[PDB]
Design a protein around this ligand. Structure first.
Ligand SMILES: [C]C1=C([C])[C]=C2C(=[C]1)N([C][C]([O])[C]([O])[C]([O])[C]OP([O])(=O)OP([O])(=O)O[C][C]1O[C](N3[C]=NC4=C3N=[C]N=C4[N])[C]([O])[C]1[O])C1=NC(=O)[N]C(=O)C1=N2C(=O)[C][C]C1=[C][C]=C(Br)[C]=[C]1
Lengths: 133, 666
């Protein structure tokens, strides 16, 4: 039914190693080559990868910006609103960013803002102007 | 098995079915009612048992009926018909029994028998037992043919057959009781000793053997399941097919490395793409910090766009830092899924150079078994007899196998030194012309009714012919003589003053350096009561060694043995013998084998007797005159002593039926 456990012999394979007197050593040589031609282009992408690793040396530690631990407010200081407007202009709809910028407003008070002040900030215009980019 | 059913098995017959051979003679019974068949079978089996339990005395019809019971011993024409059938075909009272009724005063018909090898003797005994005039012509000055035994002082060693292959159903089982032969078993444990002369570790020894067995079945799969049996018109040999498998196992080894390291690069090259994304991020991140720092220099108080700016860039940066962190994450994962892959390379090799050498000793073992280069054995058939294998363990004859022929030979008309040169057989009889081997011109003519030819296949193969047939052998017979394989194997007998090997070790092997020389002195036997060692020369080697002086060979022998046992535990041999069977003119080799392009069916062809033309044309079709027996004639037990013996019995049955008539079929 099946070859011994671990013995390998496909139909098609056999016809290949019998095809002439040295289809034998032909096939076994193509792989001997075909292999080194991989085994070698490892080095290459290992050395490529090796220099790129050294450029990333130093992580991003010098560039890390401390923790902004601060609480949500209900009040929209006229300051806060203005930060908001420009956040929209430069961010469109990423309510998460917009939230992160103003610093003390939840991802939704934001959404709500969008509707309340839509009124008097022409948030329409503002937004369509962000779409031009 | 045992009981009455032991007999049927011990006699090589199905205890609950009638054979084709029986059908032939009892077509009334086998075509008839089931009830009767059972009676018959029993009678057969019972008789068998009776013969078997006591094979040192003839078993008569009367003595039988006696121990038989009712209902069975009710019908005596059966019991007679059956006892007879059995007797005729040497199933009972064969070999060396004591006669109750001494031999029929006057004889009937005359038979010449070429060769007094076992097949020869066995058939002779039968025929004489059946009251015929029987004479044997033997080219040699001793009986036994390919059953040589060397004797000198207490040195005693076979150069011929040597092993009995287990008694479970083996006719020799009976002979063994009939004749004083000392039967010692073969302890299957065989240590190997590489070219250097040091043991092969239980490690390898086991892995290689087991790889060997795996490789065999492997071919067997190619044969049956893939039908790989012809190639470029030639029949495919076992050797070929073992190469094609080993190759494919080498191929697959590589195929695996390839797609293992190929899995490395596909990873190693995700790691490339990732790093590039990482560097080009520490890129903007660098220059973004810049911009934030610069816009945090604008000191308060500041207007709102300039405030937003700070606040803006701040986000954009912790944002880009989340990103780059989730990447250092990823990075570390790949970096390990890479020692992972570097930790488990698949095997470097299919077989090492030391491995593939040991595998060769296992191939030499096979070369020995079949007496031939596996490049010659038919893949499809090489082992067709492996079905009919005896049970129990193999033995050796401690007191020299020759003891058997000589025993059989006893009481028989035998012309030693008589070389048959021409066989002539005609409608009304045959004549056999032999010469004397000492002065060759001194000539002999034998006239008989039938010739039974036990000539080795080697001999039958000789070109140009050593024996000549008149008229020549039919094209269907000669074709079978060519198609069939007659192989070779040689022995070296080493005789010392002292045991220096392991006394509890029957056989130990040596591992030659090359494929080429795998068979050369590849195995040794401590078998005997004296200090004698036996060295096999098999496979490709055997043929080539015949061309080398005794000394040289015995040289290579000691050489090897010192290597294994220390350069001064090994004395000079007192007495040394060396076979050369392919050389020997009355053998021309060792024993047959199923060559590529032959089959089991060619063996049948060998046994088919020859019927001459008619003399006066438009006369009736003759009786057949020329018959064949011998190792090469017996489909199911080729190349063996027991196989020969068996064929001898067979032809006797057949000849007797022919010339004395078969009364028992009515
Ligand atoms: C060689 C050998 C060796 C070395 C070893 C062995 C063997 C072998 N084997 C086999 C046997 O031996 C055989 O088979 C037999 O013996 C045979 O017999 P037959 O058939 O009968 O034959 P022969 O013997 O040969 O005889 C014949 C005769 O004839 C004569 N001639 C010739 N020519 C002529 C004549 N005459 C007249 N004229 C003319 N011309 C001769 O001379 C003779 O006599 C074996 N077997 C067994 O069983 N066992 C064993 O062991 C063996 N061995 C081994 O070792 C191995 C093998 C085997 C195989 C398989 C098996 Br399953 C087991 C084993």
């Amino acid at each position: 039914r099946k070859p011994p456990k671990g013995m390998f012999l496909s139909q098609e394979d056999v016809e290949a190693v019998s095809a002439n007197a040295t289809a034998a050593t032909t096939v076994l040589r193509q792989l001997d080559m075909e292999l080194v031609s991989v085994k070698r282009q490892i080095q290459n992408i290992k050395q490529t990868n090796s220099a790129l690793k050294e450029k990333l040396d130093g992580g991003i530690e010098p560039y890390r910006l401390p923790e902004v631990i601060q609480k949500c407010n209900a009040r929209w200081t006229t300051e806060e609103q203005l930060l908001a407007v420009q956040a929209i202009r430069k961010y469109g709809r990423d309510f998460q960013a917009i939230s992160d910028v103003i610093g003390n407003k939840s991802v939704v008070q934001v959404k709500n803002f969008f509707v309340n002040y839509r009124r008097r900030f022409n948030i329409d215009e503002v937004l369509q102007e962000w779409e031009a980019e | 098995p045992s009981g009455v059913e032991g007999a049927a098995f011990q006699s090589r017959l199905p205890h609950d079915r009638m054979t084709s051979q029986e059908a032939a003679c009892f077509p009334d019974i086998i075509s008839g009612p089931q009830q009767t068949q059972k009676v018959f079978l029993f009678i057969r089996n019972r008789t068998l048992q009776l013969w078997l339990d006591n094979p040192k005395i003839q078993l008569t019809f009367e003595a039988t009926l006696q121990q038989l019971e009712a209902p069975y011993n009710s019908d005596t024409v059966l019991v007679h018909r059956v006892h007879s059938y059995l007797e005729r075909h040497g199933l009972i009272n064969f070999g060396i029994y004591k006669r109750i009724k001494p031999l029929p005063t006057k004889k009937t018909g005359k038979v010449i028998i070429i060769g007094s090898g076992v097949s020869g003797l066995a058939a002779a005994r039968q025929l004489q037992s059946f009251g015929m005039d029987v004479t044997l012509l033997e080219a040699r000055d001793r009986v036994g043919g390919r059953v040589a035994t060397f004797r000198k002082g207490n040195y005693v060693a076979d150069l011929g057959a040597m092993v009995v292959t287990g008694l479970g159903g083996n006719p020799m089982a009976v002979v063994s009781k009939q004749v004083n032969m000392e039967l010692a078993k073969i302890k299957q444990k065989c240590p190997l000793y590489e070219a250097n002369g040091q043991a092969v570790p239980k490690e390898k020894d086991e892995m290689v053997e087991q790889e060997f067995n795996r490789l065999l079945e492997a071919t067997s799969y190619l044969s049956h399941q893939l039908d790989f049996n012809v190639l470029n018109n030639k029949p495919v040999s076992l050797g070929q097919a073992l190469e094609v498998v080993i190759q494919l196992q080498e191929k697959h080894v590589k195929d695996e490395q390839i797609e293992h390291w190929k899995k490395i690069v596909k990873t190693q090259e995700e790691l490339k793409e990732l790093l590039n994304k990482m560097v080009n991020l520490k890129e903007k991140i660098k220059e973004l910090h810049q911009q934030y720092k610069e816009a945090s220099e604008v000191k308060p108080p500041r207007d709102i766009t300039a405030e937003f700016l700070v606040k803006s860039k701040h986000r954009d940066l912790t944002a880009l830092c989340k990103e780059y962190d989730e990447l250092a994450e990823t990075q570390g994962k790949l970096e390990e899924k890479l020692q992972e892959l570097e930790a488990n390379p698949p095997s470097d090799v299919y077989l090492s150079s030391r491995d593939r050498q040991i595998l060769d000793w296992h191939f030499a073992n096979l070369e020995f078994a079949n007496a031939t280069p596996l490049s010659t054995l038919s893949l499809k058939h090489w082992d067709q007899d492996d079905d009919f294998e005896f049970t129990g363990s193999h033995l050796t004859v401690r007191n020299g196998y020759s003891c058997v022929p000589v025993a059989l030979a006893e009481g028989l008309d035998i012309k030693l030194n008589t070389a048959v040169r021409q066989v002539r057989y005609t409608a009304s009889g045959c004549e056999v012309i032999a010469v004397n081997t000492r002065s060759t011109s001194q000539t002999f003519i034998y006239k008989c009714d039938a010739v039974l030819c036990t000539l080795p296949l080697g001999v039958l193969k000789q070109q140009p012919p050593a024996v000549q047939f008149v008229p020549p052998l039919p094209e269907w017979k000669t074709s079978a003589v060519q198609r069939m394989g007659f192989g070779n194997l040689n022995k070296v007998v080493l005789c010392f003053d002292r045991v220096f090997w392991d006394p509890s070790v029957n056989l130990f092997g040596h591992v030659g350096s090359t494929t080429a020389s795998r068979g050369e002195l590849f195995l040794f036997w401590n078998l005997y009561k004296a200090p004698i060692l036996l060295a096999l020369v098999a496979g490709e080697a055997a043929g080539i060694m015949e061309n080398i002086s005794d000394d040289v060979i015995v040289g290579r022998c000691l050489a090897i043995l010192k290597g294994i046992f220390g350069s001064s535990a090994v004395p000079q041999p007192k007495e040394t013998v060396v076979s050369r069977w392919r050389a020997d003119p009355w053998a021309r080799g060792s024993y047959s084998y199923v060559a590529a392009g032959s089959s089991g069916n060619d063996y049948d062809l060998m046994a088919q007797p020859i019927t001459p033309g008619p003399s006066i044309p438009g006369a009736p079709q003759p009786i057949p005159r020329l018959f064949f027996a011998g190792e090469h004639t017996i489909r199911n037990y080729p190349a063996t002593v027991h196989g020969a013996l068996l064929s001898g019995l067979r032809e006797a049955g057949r000849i007797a039926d022919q010339f004395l008539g078969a009364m028992y079929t009515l």
